[model samples]
Target: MDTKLYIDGQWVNSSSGKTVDKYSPVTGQVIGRMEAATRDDVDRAIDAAEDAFWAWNDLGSVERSKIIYRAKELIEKNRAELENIIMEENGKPVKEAKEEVDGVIDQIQYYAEWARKLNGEVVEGTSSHRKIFQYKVPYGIVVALTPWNFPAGMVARKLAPALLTGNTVVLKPSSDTPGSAEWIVRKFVEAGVPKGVLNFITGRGSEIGDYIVEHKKVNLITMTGSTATGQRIMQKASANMAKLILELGGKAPFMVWKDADMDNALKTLLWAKYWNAGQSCIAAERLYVHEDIYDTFMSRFVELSRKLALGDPKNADMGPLINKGALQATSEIVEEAKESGAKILFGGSQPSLSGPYRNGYFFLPTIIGNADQKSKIFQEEIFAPVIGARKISSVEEMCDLANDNKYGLASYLFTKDPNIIFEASERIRFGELYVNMPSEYLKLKNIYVDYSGKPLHINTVRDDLFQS
Candidate 1:
């Protein structure tokens, strides 16, 4: 497949005629070619978004939502195609890909429903004759930087709310999974998303990342990726003071209490950790099981993990890591943990595959036992098919150990005890804490004025006001 950058509602190539090949992690082969956006290309997209912001914002929330609603319909019509693109680009299993597409639809509908509530406020001031009017408006141009893990979903997550609030967007999907984003953009265009209202670009972030974030015209920058990248973005965006809404790395703790259902905990653990080949930032990175069930749970967990089939994603339980870099990083972390006294209970190396799978970037679904919270494997964001498990004596100990990590994005806990659940919920430090289940608006400017048209009623404050 040949993919070109979507700028100003037209699919076009780079002005410099540069191109890049997108590889499939499942086959280790080039599956598609994309235009490598240059600085000049990025500027054109930004300029278009800035130029189009006025008309798009002027359309009002109801009108903007109409286009998004139609786009949602188009998305459903092309659901399978979008899922296939994600599967091919990110090497995700069919089930995961389908869920991502479903998430995109849900996000669109959810944000569209908020249009009715996007209203301003009228308030009475200190004086009976005075009034204050508060209005919510768009931030103009938004630069949405999405990750490769959930290309279709992230695009909708960021673009839906941004555009629904009347801000034009310049979206840049990760180069590893640009196909899914491009396909979604095509649907929006087909659904009559106006020119320059939504622009898509494909390229190496190293080349144009700073350029786009530092652009003075960019009103906001929303990204979902690594903590390091988020830090860089924060620094660069400070040049023009672009507002940021970043969802960075995560070291989510998955706790299984003694009162929890062991069977259900195991099922949720597998899905949470290994989905997307464990490439998700919110994937279960650390595991804490009650000592009572540790022996039973760890044994079953390792056994079930070993049973997970890793090969062609279509027929397999899981697929390869996104690339060799991911594979090597997983390996290094596992090794570092082993050196730090963590026992590799199962799958600490890459699996040897046959035929077309030979060159694929596959890693065994690994579970490291006896790993402490301080271990590198448990501390770092291992965005791969690997997890480190440790036994805990109490929920208090579990909370302390879990919160020891630098990341505080998400955490999960399973317990039947209502008191323990409520206590743990209070103790956990994650922004999003999931108890047992799986799991955006605008600014307001307040304008105050004396509508009485008479400033003579000041009492003693008139003398003080005149002194200033």
Candidate 2:
């Protein structure tokens, strides 16, 4: 694919006259290159989105929904090709890539319905004939800065909702997985979206992303990334009083009670810790097991860890990290954990591969035992196929321990007792809680279930200024 900036319905080269090479993480080869956008390119994209907001946001909910439905159809038709490209660029397994594509489709369709359901509150006024009601409104131009992991899905999650709410978008996708974003924009254009309604640019975050987030023309900033990056964006957006949606870092905890089913816990842990090669924000980094069953859990966990297939993601059970930096970071975390007295029950070694897989950034599925709450591996997000198990005495202690993290994104608990599930679910200080399941896997399935439960109603409001 020819990677170029898409702005104002035109594909063009960067004024910087520079390009960034796109590498295949699976083969460690430069597959393609895209225009390296500069501050000027960022400005142009924001300008296009700002100008388009007038007509784009003025469309009725039904009309907007119709256009988005068309985009959804195009995504479904090109699903296979898109999935292949994503796997090649992002180094995820073929199945995972397909799942991500499915998620993008589901998100678009769900938000398409939400376009009509944007409602407001109704309040009684002093007079009988007078009534007051509030409604949702577009924030003009919205800038979405998506991350590398689950590139296509993350972009869709931000774009679908914002666009359906009548906002135009200036999207800056991650440099590591540029192709998926480029392909998404191409699909949008093919689906008959207006020239300036959806604009795309590619470049380093330090350059183009900062400009987009700080620009006065961009009235809203939405980002899915590290906490530090989100903080930086918040600082910049504050200058213009821009609205921000920051889905930042997370260090989720997975708790196993004494009465929990061993088979179910192992199944959940396998998928939870290894999904996306453990690069997800909500991936379970801390495994809290009850002291009664700690030894049994560790024994089986280590045995299962050794059985995981290792090689190219296409044939293996798990894939490599997105790039070499992630691989190095994973190795360092494992080494440090061992040095700090954590036991390597099963695997702490790198994968052995040949041919195309030889150069891929792969790490073996690792299990660490006897970890303490204060250990670096348990305290921070080690975004690799490594999970640290800590033994806690009681459920109350587990709840307190889980809430001790600075990050409060998600948490998990395993139990058959309804009372225990209710207690933990209520007491856990997290935005999302999973009982008898892992946080990451539950999110993947919730994306589909939630999409199916959307309501169908068009939310409309009279223009107050126009009425006056």
lDDT of 1 at 420: 88
Report, for all candidates in order, the number of backbone clashes.
Answer: 0, 1
For residue 26, model 2's alpha carbon misses the true position, in angstroms, by 1.2
Question: How far is each candidate from the true structure, as Cα RMSD in Å?
Answer: 2.6, 8.8
Candidate 1 minimal-lDDT segment of 10 residues:
435-444
User: In terms of TM-score, how similar is model 1 to the real structure?
Assistant: 0.94
How much RMSD separates candidate 2 from the native structure?
8.8
lDDT of 2: 0.81
Best by lDDT: 1
lDDT of model 2 at residue 311?
Answer: 66
Best by TM-score: 1
How high is the lDDT of residue 451 in model 2? 28
**Per-residue lDDT of 59 in model 2:** 80
The residue-by-residue lDDT of candidate 1 on 220-297, one tens digit each, is: 889999999999999998899988998897999999998888788888898888888888877898999899988999
